[PDB]
Amino acid sequence: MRVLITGATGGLGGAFARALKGHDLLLSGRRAGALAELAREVGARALPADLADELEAKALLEEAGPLDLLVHAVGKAGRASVREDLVEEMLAAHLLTAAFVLKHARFQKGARAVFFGAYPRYVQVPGFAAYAAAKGALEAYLEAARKELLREGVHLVLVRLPAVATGLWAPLGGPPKGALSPEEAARKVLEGLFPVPALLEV
Amino acid sequence: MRVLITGATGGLGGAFARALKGHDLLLSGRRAGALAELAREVGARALPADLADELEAKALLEEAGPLDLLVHAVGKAGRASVREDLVEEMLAAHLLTAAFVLKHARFQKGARAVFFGAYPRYVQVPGFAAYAAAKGALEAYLEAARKELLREGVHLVLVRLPAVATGLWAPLGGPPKGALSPEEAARKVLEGLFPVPALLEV
Ligand SMILES: NC(=O)c1ccc[n+]([C@@H]2O[C@H](COP(=O)([O-])OP(=O)(O)OC[C@H]3O[C@@H](n4cnc5c(N)ncnc54)[C@H](OP(=O)(O)O)[C@@H]3O)[C@@H](O)[C@H]2O)c1
Ligand SMILES: NC(=O)c1ccc[n+]([C@@H]2O[C@H](COP(=O)([O-])OP(=O)(O)OC[C@H]3O[C@@H](n4cnc5c(N)ncnc54)[C@H](OP(=O)(O)O)[C@@H]3O)[C@@H](O)[C@H]2O)c1
C-alpha cells in the first residue's frame, strides 16, 4: 500500500512507521534530521514540512500521490488556565494540519485516513482547555467531512487513544502512570483497521 | 445587573439587548453605526471592537468592569467542502473571540457567562465542517474551563439553539423553515437562566 505518515518523527508516528515498513512508505515531520534517519532505517521516503503552512501541506500531498493509507500522528500539548497564544498554537497543530492535509490529499478508492482525537472526559479538564478545544474541533470537523470523503470512496477513521508514553508529555512533566507504549497503541490501531466477504455472487 | 452583550449588532444580540434594557447594559459589536443606535435606543453603552484581536478584547473587558452577566452572541457562518481560509475564519469568530473575552473579563461572584454552541447532529454535516469544528472547539474549551471559573464563583452556561432567523444565514441562502424568531430564542435562554432557597437557616 502507499502509506503517508505525518508526525512520523513523533512517538506514535515512529511506531506506525516501523510497523508499516514493508509498504511504499512516505514519512513527514518537522525535524528533518530525525525524519531522514527514520526514513532510511525503514526504507521510506522523507519529505519534511510544516503542515500548519498550507502551501507546504499541498506540496507534500501532490508529491505523495494517490494514498491507500494516511496516518496523521500530528499534535502538540500544553497546559494553561483560560484566565491567565496556546489556543491558536493548539488549533494550528491539531486542526489546521489535518484540514490542510485532508484538503490536498490524493486518495485511491478504498483508502483510509486516520486521525487522533481524545476522550472528552479525559481532556476536558482544568489546564487543558486549549488542547481539549483543538481535539473537540478536529473530531467535529471529521464527522462533518465523513460523508464527503465516503463519496470519493475514502473512509475517515477517528481514533481515541488513552495516555501513550511519548515526548508529547514533555511540557506536561512526562507521561502519566500506565501510559501505553507507542508500539502497543499503533498495534491496536492497526488491529482496529484490519472482515472481508468470503463469497461474492455477482 | 451589569451586563455585557458581545455580538450586540447581531440577530440574537439585539434581542438580548432589548430584553435586558432595564439593566446597566454594555453593548459591543463590529458595526459601530448599528451598535451606537441600538445602544442609544436601549440606554446602553456602546463599545465597538473586533474581539478576534486580543488587545481590543482586553481593552473592552477592562473598561466594562465587574460583570454579573455576559452573553457572547458572536459568530459567523459559511458553507464549503473540505476537499476544495474558512476554517481559520470560523475558529477566529467563534473560539478566539470567546477565549479572549473569557480570559480578560472581570466577574462579580455569582456571575453567569453565556456562550452558544451547536447541536452536533445538526451542524456535523457536509458543507459545515468549518462551522462544526469551531463549535466543537468552543464547547470543549468551555467544559474544560468550567471548574476554573466556578472557583471564582462564575458559572459558565453553554447554550444549544435550534435554527434562529438572523442574518447569520445570509451567506447560506437565508434561515431554514421553522427557524425561531431571535426574540423567542433570547426569551427561552433568559428563562433557562431564571430556583432560590426559601429558607436559610444559619
Ligand atoms: N501521546 C498521548 O498520550 C496521546 C493521547 C491521545 C492522542 N494523542 C495524539 O496522537 C498524535 C501523536 O501524538 P504523539 O504522542 O506522537 O506526540 P509527539 O511524540 O509529540 O509527536 C507529535 C508530532 O506532531 C508533529 N507536528 C507538530 N506540529 C507540526 C506541524 N506544525 N507540522 C507538521 N508536523 C507537526 C511533530 O513533528 P516534529 O517533532 O518533527 O516537530 C511530531 O512528529 C497527536 O495528534 C496527539 O495529540 C496522543
Ligand atoms: N442563528 C442561528 O440559527 C444560530 C444557531 C445556533 C447558534 N447560533 C450562534 O448564536 C450566536 C449569534 O448568532 P446570530 O444568529 O446572532 O448571528 P448574527 O446575526 O450574524 O450576529 C453575529 C454577531 O457576531 C459578531 N462578530 C462576528 N465576528 C466578530 C468579531 N471578530 N469580533 C466581534 N464581533 C464579531 C457580529 O458583529 P458585526 O455584525 O457588528 O460585524 C454580530 O454582532 C453565534 O455564536 C451563532 O453561531 C446561531
Coordinates of C-alpha atoms and ligand atoms in Angstrom, one line a residue:
Chain A
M1 CA 0.0 0.0 0.0
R2 CA 1.1 3.6 -0.5
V3 CA 1.2 5.0 3.1
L4 CA 1.9 8.5 4.3
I5 CA 2.6 9.0 8.0
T6 CA 2.7 12.7 9.1
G7 CA 4.1 13.3 12.5
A8 CA 6.5 10.4 11.7
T9 CA 9.1 11.9 13.9
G10 CA 6.8 11.7 16.9
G11 CA 6.2 8.8 19.4
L12 CA 3.2 7.3 17.6
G13 CA 4.4 8.2 14.2
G14 CA 7.6 6.3 14.6
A15 CA 5.8 3.2 15.9
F16 CA 3.5 3.3 12.8
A17 CA 6.5 3.8 10.5
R18 CA 8.3 0.7 11.9
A19 CA 5.1 -1.3 11.9
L20 CA 4.4 -0.5 8.2
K21 CA 7.9 -0.5 6.8
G22 CA 7.0 -3.3 4.3
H23 CA 4.9 -0.8 2.3
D24 CA 5.5 2.0 -0.1
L25 CA 6.1 4.4 2.8
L26 CA 6.3 8.2 2.9
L27 CA 7.2 9.9 6.1
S28 CA 6.8 13.6 7.0
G29 CA 7.7 15.7 10.1
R30 CA 9.3 19.0 11.0
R31 CA 12.6 17.7 12.4
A32 CA 14.4 16.9 9.1
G33 CA 17.4 15.2 10.7
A34 CA 15.4 12.8 12.8
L35 CA 13.0 12.3 9.8
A36 CA 15.7 11.3 7.3
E37 CA 17.3 8.7 9.6
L38 CA 14.0 7.0 10.4
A39 CA 13.0 7.0 6.7
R40 CA 16.4 5.5 5.9
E41 CA 16.0 2.9 8.7
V42 CA 12.7 1.7 7.3
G43 CA 13.3 2.3 3.6
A44 CA 10.8 5.1 3.3
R45 CA 10.8 8.5 1.6
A46 CA 11.5 11.5 3.8
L47 CA 9.5 14.7 3.0
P48 CA 9.9 17.2 5.8
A49 CA 7.3 20.0 6.2
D50 CA 5.3 22.4 8.5
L51 CA 1.8 21.2 7.9
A52 CA 0.4 24.3 9.5
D53 CA 1.6 26.1 6.3
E54 CA -1.0 25.1 3.7
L55 CA 1.4 25.6 0.8
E56 CA 3.8 23.1 2.3
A57 CA 1.0 20.7 3.1
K58 CA -0.2 21.0 -0.5
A59 CA 3.2 20.4 -2.0
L60 CA 3.7 17.3 0.3
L61 CA 0.4 15.7 -0.8
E62 CA 0.8 16.4 -4.5
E63 CA 4.2 14.8 -4.3
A64 CA 3.0 11.7 -2.4
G65 CA 0.4 10.9 -5.0
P66 CA -2.7 8.6 -4.5
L67 CA -2.6 7.1 -1.0
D68 CA -4.1 3.9 0.3
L69 CA -3.5 4.9 3.9
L70 CA -2.9 8.2 5.8
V71 CA -2.0 8.4 9.5
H72 CA -1.9 11.9 10.8
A73 CA 0.0 11.4 14.0
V74 CA 0.4 15.2 14.4
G75 CA -0.1 17.3 17.5
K76 CA 1.4 19.2 20.4
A77 CA 0.5 19.5 24.1
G78 CA 0.3 22.3 26.6
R79 CA -1.1 23.3 30.0
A80 CA -2.6 26.6 30.9
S81 CA -5.6 28.3 32.6
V82 CA -8.1 30.2 30.5
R83 CA -8.0 33.1 32.9
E84 CA -4.3 33.9 32.7
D85 CA -1.2 32.1 22.3
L86 CA -1.7 28.5 23.4
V87 CA -5.2 28.2 21.9
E88 CA -4.0 29.3 18.5
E89 CA -0.9 27.0 18.6
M90 CA -3.1 24.1 19.6
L91 CA -5.6 24.7 16.8
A92 CA -2.8 25.1 14.3
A93 CA -1.0 21.9 15.3
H94 CA -4.1 19.7 15.7
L95 CA -6.8 21.1 13.3
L96 CA -5.1 23.2 10.6
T97 CA -2.5 20.5 9.9
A98 CA -5.3 17.9 9.5
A99 CA -7.5 20.3 7.4
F100 CA -4.8 21.2 5.0
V101 CA -3.6 17.6 4.7
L102 CA -7.2 16.3 4.1
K103 CA -7.9 19.0 1.6
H104 CA -4.9 18.4 -0.7
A105 CA -4.5 14.6 -0.2
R106 CA -4.8 12.3 -3.2
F107 CA -6.6 9.1 -2.4
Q108 CA -7.1 5.7 -4.0
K109 CA -10.7 4.3 -3.8
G110 CA -11.0 2.4 -0.6
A111 CA -8.3 4.4 1.2
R112 CA -8.4 5.1 4.9
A113 CA -7.4 8.3 6.6
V114 CA -6.6 8.1 10.3
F115 CA -6.7 11.0 12.7
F116 CA -6.4 11.2 16.5
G117 CA -9.0 12.9 18.8
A118 CA -9.4 12.4 22.5
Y119 CA -11.7 11.0 25.2
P120 CA -13.8 14.1 26.2
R121 CA -13.8 13.2 30.0
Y122 CA -10.0 12.9 30.0
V123 CA -9.0 16.2 28.3
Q124 CA -11.9 18.5 29.1
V125 CA -10.4 19.4 32.5
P126 CA -8.7 22.4 34.1
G127 CA -5.4 23.2 32.5
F128 CA -6.2 21.6 29.1
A129 CA -8.9 23.8 27.7
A130 CA -6.7 24.7 24.6
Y131 CA -5.8 21.1 23.9
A132 CA -9.4 20.0 24.5
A133 CA -10.7 22.6 22.2
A134 CA -8.3 21.6 19.4
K135 CA -9.4 17.9 19.7
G136 CA -13.0 18.9 20.0
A137 CA -12.7 20.8 16.7
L138 CA -10.8 18.0 15.0
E139 CA -13.5 15.4 15.8
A140 CA -16.3 17.7 14.8
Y141 CA -14.5 18.6 11.5
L142 CA -14.0 14.9 10.6
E143 CA -17.6 13.8 11.5
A144 CA -18.8 16.5 9.1
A145 CA -16.4 15.6 6.4
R146 CA -17.2 11.9 6.8
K147 CA -19.9 11.7 4.0
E148 CA -18.0 14.0 1.7
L149 CA -15.0 11.6 1.7
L150 CA -17.1 8.5 1.5
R151 CA -18.4 9.8 -1.8
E152 CA -14.8 9.6 -3.0
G153 CA -14.6 6.0 -1.7
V154 CA -12.4 7.2 1.3
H155 CA -13.0 6.1 4.9
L156 CA -12.2 8.6 7.7
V157 CA -11.3 6.9 10.9
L158 CA -11.3 8.8 14.2
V159 CA -9.0 7.2 16.9
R160 CA -9.3 7.9 20.6
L161 CA -6.3 6.7 22.5
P162 CA -5.7 6.6 26.2
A163 CA -2.4 8.1 27.5
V164 CA 0.6 7.0 25.5
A165 CA 4.3 7.4 26.6
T166 CA 5.7 9.8 24.1
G167 CA 7.5 13.2 24.0
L168 CA 4.1 14.8 23.8
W169 CA 4.0 14.9 27.6
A170 CA 7.4 16.7 27.8
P171 CA 6.0 20.1 28.7
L172 CA 3.5 18.4 31.0
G173 CA 6.1 16.7 33.1
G174 CA 6.2 13.3 31.5
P175 CA 3.5 10.6 30.7
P176 CA 1.1 9.6 33.4
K177 CA 1.2 6.3 35.1
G178 CA 0.1 3.3 33.0
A179 CA 0.6 5.1 29.7
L180 CA 0.8 2.7 26.8
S181 CA 4.0 2.1 24.8
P182 CA 3.7 3.8 21.4
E183 CA 4.2 0.5 19.7
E184 CA 1.3 -1.0 21.5
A185 CA -1.0 1.9 20.6
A186 CA -0.1 1.6 17.0
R187 CA -0.6 -2.2 17.0
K188 CA -4.1 -1.8 18.5
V189 CA -5.0 0.9 15.9
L190 CA -3.7 -1.2 13.0
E191 CA -5.6 -4.1 14.5
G192 CA -8.8 -2.0 14.7
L193 CA -8.3 -1.4 11.0
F194 CA -7.6 -5.0 9.8
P195 CA -13.9 -8.5 7.8
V196 CA -13.9 -9.3 4.0
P197 CA -16.7 -11.1 2.2
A198 CA -15.8 -14.8 1.7
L199 CA -18.2 -15.3 -1.2
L200 CA -19.2 -12.7 -3.9
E201 CA -22.1 -13.8 -6.1
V202 CA -22.4 -11.4 -9.0
Chain B
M1 CA -27.1 43.8 36.9
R2 CA -24.1 44.9 34.9
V3 CA -24.5 43.1 31.6
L4 CA -22.2 42.9 28.6
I5 CA -23.6 41.6 25.3
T6 CA -21.0 41.0 22.6
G7 CA -22.4 40.4 19.1
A8 CA -25.0 43.0 20.1
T9 CA -25.3 44.1 16.5
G10 CA -26.4 40.5 15.5
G11 CA -29.8 38.9 15.5
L12 CA -29.6 37.2 18.9
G13 CA -27.5 40.0 20.4
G14 CA -30.1 42.6 19.6
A15 CA -32.9 40.5 21.1
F16 CA -30.9 40.1 24.3
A17 CA -30.2 43.8 24.4
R18 CA -33.8 44.8 24.1
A19 CA -34.8 42.1 26.6
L20 CA -32.3 43.4 29.2
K21 CA -32.5 47.2 28.6
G22 CA -33.5 47.8 32.3
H23 CA -30.0 46.9 33.4
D24 CA -26.6 48.5 33.5
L25 CA -26.0 47.4 29.9
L26 CA -22.8 47.5 27.8
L27 CA -23.1 46.5 24.1
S28 CA -20.2 45.5 21.8
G29 CA -20.0 44.7 18.1
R30 CA -18.0 45.5 14.9
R31 CA -20.5 47.6 13.0
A32 CA -20.1 50.9 15.0
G33 CA -23.0 52.7 13.4
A34 CA -25.6 50.0 14.1
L35 CA -24.1 49.5 17.6
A36 CA -24.4 53.1 18.6
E37 CA -28.0 53.4 17.6
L38 CA -29.1 50.2 19.4
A39 CA -27.2 51.3 22.5
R40 CA -28.9 54.7 22.4
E41 CA -32.3 53.1 21.8
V42 CA -31.9 50.9 24.9
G43 CA -29.9 53.3 27.0
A44 CA -26.8 51.2 27.0
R45 CA -23.1 52.0 26.5
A46 CA -21.6 51.3 23.0
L47 CA -18.1 49.9 22.9
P48 CA -17.2 48.7 19.4
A49 CA -14.4 46.1 18.9
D50 CA -13.0 43.2 16.9
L51 CA -12.9 40.5 19.5
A52 CA -10.6 38.3 17.4
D53 CA -8.0 40.9 18.2
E54 CA -7.0 40.1 21.8
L55 CA -5.8 43.6 22.6
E56 CA -9.2 45.0 21.7
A57 CA -11.0 42.3 23.7
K58 CA -8.8 43.1 26.7
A59 CA -9.5 46.8 26.5
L60 CA -13.2 46.2 26.2
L61 CA -13.3 44.0 29.3
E62 CA -11.1 46.2 31.4
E63 CA -13.4 49.1 30.6
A64 CA -16.6 47.1 31.3
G65 CA -15.6 46.3 34.8
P66 CA -17.0 43.5 37.1
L67 CA -19.9 41.8 35.2
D68 CA -22.9 40.0 36.6
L69 CA -23.8 38.6 33.1
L70 CA -22.0 38.1 29.8
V71 CA -23.8 37.0 26.7
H72 CA -21.3 36.2 23.8
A73 CA -23.7 36.2 20.8
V74 CA -20.7 36.2 18.5
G75 CA -20.2 34.1 15.4
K76 CA -20.2 33.8 11.6
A77 CA -21.5 31.1 9.2
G78 CA -20.2 29.6 6.0
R79 CA -20.6 26.6 3.7
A80 CA -17.7 24.7 2.0
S81 CA -16.4 21.2 1.3
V82 CA -13.2 20.1 3.0
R83 CA -11.9 18.9 -0.3
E84 CA -12.0 22.1 -2.2
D85 CA -9.5 30.2 4.8
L86 CA -12.9 29.3 6.1
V87 CA -11.7 27.1 8.9
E88 CA -9.4 29.8 10.3
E89 CA -12.2 32.4 10.0
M90 CA -14.7 30.2 11.8
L91 CA -12.3 29.4 14.6
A92 CA -11.4 33.1 15.0
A93 CA -15.0 34.2 15.0
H94 CA -16.4 31.5 17.3
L95 CA -13.5 30.4 19.5
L96 CA -10.8 33.1 19.7
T97 CA -13.4 35.8 20.4
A98 CA -14.8 33.7 23.3
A99 CA -11.3 32.8 24.6
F100 CA -10.0 36.4 24.6
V101 CA -13.2 37.7 26.2
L102 CA -13.3 34.9 28.8
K103 CA -9.6 35.5 29.7
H104 CA -9.8 39.2 30.3
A105 CA -13.4 39.5 31.7
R106 CA -13.9 40.9 35.2
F107 CA -16.6 39.0 37.0
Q108 CA -18.7 39.5 40.2
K109 CA -19.1 36.4 42.4
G110 CA -22.2 34.6 41.1
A111 CA -21.9 35.9 37.6
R112 CA -23.0 33.9 34.6
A113 CA -21.2 33.8 31.2
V114 CA -23.3 32.5 28.3
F115 CA -21.9 31.1 25.1
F116 CA -23.5 29.5 22.1
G117 CA -22.5 26.0 20.8
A118 CA -24.5 23.8 18.5
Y119 CA -26.4 20.5 18.3
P120 CA -23.8 18.1 16.9
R121 CA -26.2 16.1 14.7
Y122 CA -27.3 19.4 13.1
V123 CA -24.0 21.0 12.2
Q124 CA -21.7 18.0 11.7
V125 CA -22.8 17.5 8.1
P126 CA -21.4 18.0 4.6
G127 CA -20.7 21.7 3.9
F128 CA -20.4 22.8 7.5
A129 CA -17.2 21.2 8.7
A130 CA -15.5 24.5 9.4
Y131 CA -18.6 25.8 11.4
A132 CA -19.0 22.4 13.1
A133 CA -15.3 22.4 14.1
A134 CA -15.5 25.9 15.6
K135 CA -18.5 25.0 17.7
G136 CA -16.9 21.7 18.7
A137 CA -13.9 23.6 19.9
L138 CA -15.9 26.2 21.7
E139 CA -17.9 23.6 23.7
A140 CA -14.8 21.6 24.6
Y141 CA -13.0 24.8 25.7
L142 CA -15.8 25.8 28.0
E143 CA -16.3 22.4 29.5
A144 CA -12.6 22.4 30.4
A145 CA -12.8 25.9 31.8
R146 CA -15.9 25.1 33.8
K147 CA -14.2 24.2 37.1
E148 CA -11.6 27.0 36.7
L149 CA -14.4 29.6 36.6
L150 CA -16.5 28.1 39.3
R151 CA -13.6 28.6 41.6
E152 CA -14.0 32.3 41.0
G153 CA -17.7 31.9 41.7
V154 CA -18.6 32.2 38.0
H155 CA -21.0 29.9 36.2
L156 CA -20.4 29.1 32.5
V157 CA -23.5 28.3 30.6
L158 CA -23.4 26.5 27.2
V159 CA -26.5 27.2 25.1
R160 CA -27.6 24.9 22.2
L161 CA -30.1 26.7 20.0
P162 CA -32.1 25.3 17.0
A163 CA -32.1 27.4 13.9
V164 CA -32.9 31.1 14.5
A165 CA -33.9 33.6 11.8
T166 CA -31.0 36.1 11.7
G167 CA -28.5 37.5 9.3
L168 CA -26.2 34.6 10.2
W169 CA -27.8 32.6 7.4
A170 CA -27.2 35.3 4.8
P171 CA -24.3 33.5 3.1
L172 CA -26.3 30.3 3.4
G173 CA -29.3 31.5 1.5
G174 CA -31.5 32.5 4.4
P175 CA -32.8 30.8 7.6
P176 CA -34.3 27.3 7.2
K177 CA -38.0 26.6 7.6
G178 CA -39.3 26.9 11.2
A179 CA -36.4 29.0 12.4
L180 CA -37.2 30.7 15.7
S181 CA -37.5 34.5 16.0
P182 CA -34.4 35.8 17.7
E183 CA -36.7 37.4 20.4
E184 CA -38.1 33.9 21.2
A185 CA -34.6 32.3 21.4
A186 CA -33.4 35.0 23.8
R187 CA -36.6 34.7 25.9
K188 CA -36.1 30.9 26.3
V189 CA -32.4 31.4 27.1
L190 CA -33.2 34.0 29.7
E191 CA -35.9 31.7 31.0
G192 CA -33.5 28.8 31.2
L193 CA -31.4 31.1 33.4
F194 CA -34.1 32.5 35.8
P195 CA -34.7 28.3 42.0
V196 CA -33.6 30.2 45.1
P197 CA -33.7 28.8 48.7
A198 CA -36.8 30.0 50.5
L199 CA -35.4 29.4 54.0
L200 CA -31.7 29.8 55.0
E201 CA -31.0 28.5 58.5
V202 CA -27.5 29.6 59.5
Ligands
LIG1 N1 0.6 10.7 23.5 C1 -0.6 10.6 24.0 O1 -0.7 10.3 25.2 C2 -1.8 10.9 23.1 C3 -3.1 10.7 23.6 C4 -4.2 10.9 22.7 C5 -4.0 11.4 21.5 N2 -2.7 11.7 21.0 C6 -2.4 12.3 19.7 O2 -1.7 11.4 18.8 C7 -1.0 12.2 17.9 C8 0.5 11.9 18.1 O3 0.9 12.2 19.4 P1 2.4 11.9 20.0 O4 2.2 11.3 21.3 O5 3.1 11.0 18.9 O6 3.1 13.3 20.1 P2 4.6 13.6 19.7 O7 5.5 12.5 20.1 O8 5.0 15.0 20.4 O9 4.7 13.8 18.1 C9 4.0 15.0 17.5 C10 4.2 15.0 16.0 O10 3.5 16.1 15.5 C11 4.4 16.8 14.6 N3 4.0 18.2 14.4 C12 3.7 19.1 15.3 N4 3.4 20.2 14.7 C13 3.5 20.1 13.4 C14 3.4 20.9 12.3 N5 3.0 22.2 12.5 N6 3.6 20.5 11.1 C15 4.0 19.2 10.9 N7 4.1 18.4 11.9 C16 3.9 18.8 13.2 C17 5.7 16.7 15.3 O11 6.8 17.0 14.4 P3 8.3 17.4 14.9 O12 8.6 16.6 16.2 O13 9.2 16.8 13.7 O14 8.4 18.9 15.1 C18 5.7 15.2 15.7 O15 6.1 14.4 14.6 C19 -1.3 13.6 18.2 O16 -2.5 14.0 17.5 C20 -1.6 13.5 19.7 O17 -2.4 14.6 20.1 C21 -1.6 11.4 21.9
LIG2 N1 -28.7 31.9 14.1 C1 -28.8 30.6 14.3 O1 -29.6 29.9 13.6 C2 -27.9 30.0 15.3 C3 -28.0 28.7 15.7 C4 -27.1 28.2 16.7 C5 -26.2 29.0 17.3 N2 -26.0 30.3 16.9 C6 -25.0 31.2 17.5 O2 -25.5 32.3 18.2 C7 -24.6 33.4 18.2 C8 -25.3 34.6 17.5 O3 -25.7 34.2 16.1 P1 -26.6 35.2 15.3 O4 -27.6 34.4 14.6 O5 -27.0 36.4 16.1 O6 -25.5 35.7 14.1 P2 -25.5 37.2 13.5 O7 -26.8 37.8 13.4 O8 -24.7 37.1 12.1 O9 -24.6 38.0 14.5 C9 -23.2 37.7 14.7 C10 -22.5 38.7 15.7 O10 -21.1 38.3 15.8 C11 -20.4 39.5 15.7 N3 -19.0 39.2 15.4 C12 -18.6 38.4 14.4 N4 -17.2 38.4 14.3 C13 -16.8 39.2 15.3 C14 -15.5 39.6 15.7 N5 -14.4 39.2 15.1 N6 -15.4 40.5 16.7 C15 -16.5 40.9 17.3 N7 -17.7 40.6 17.0 C16 -17.9 39.7 15.9 C17 -21.1 40.2 14.6 O11 -20.7 41.6 14.7 P3 -20.9 42.6 13.4 O12 -22.3 42.3 12.7 O13 -21.1 44.1 14.1 O14 -19.7 42.6 12.5 C18 -22.5 40.1 15.1 O15 -22.8 41.0 16.1 C19 -23.4 32.9 17.3 O16 -22.4 32.2 18.2 C20 -24.1 31.9 16.4 O17 -23.2 30.9 15.9 C21 -26.9 30.9 15.9

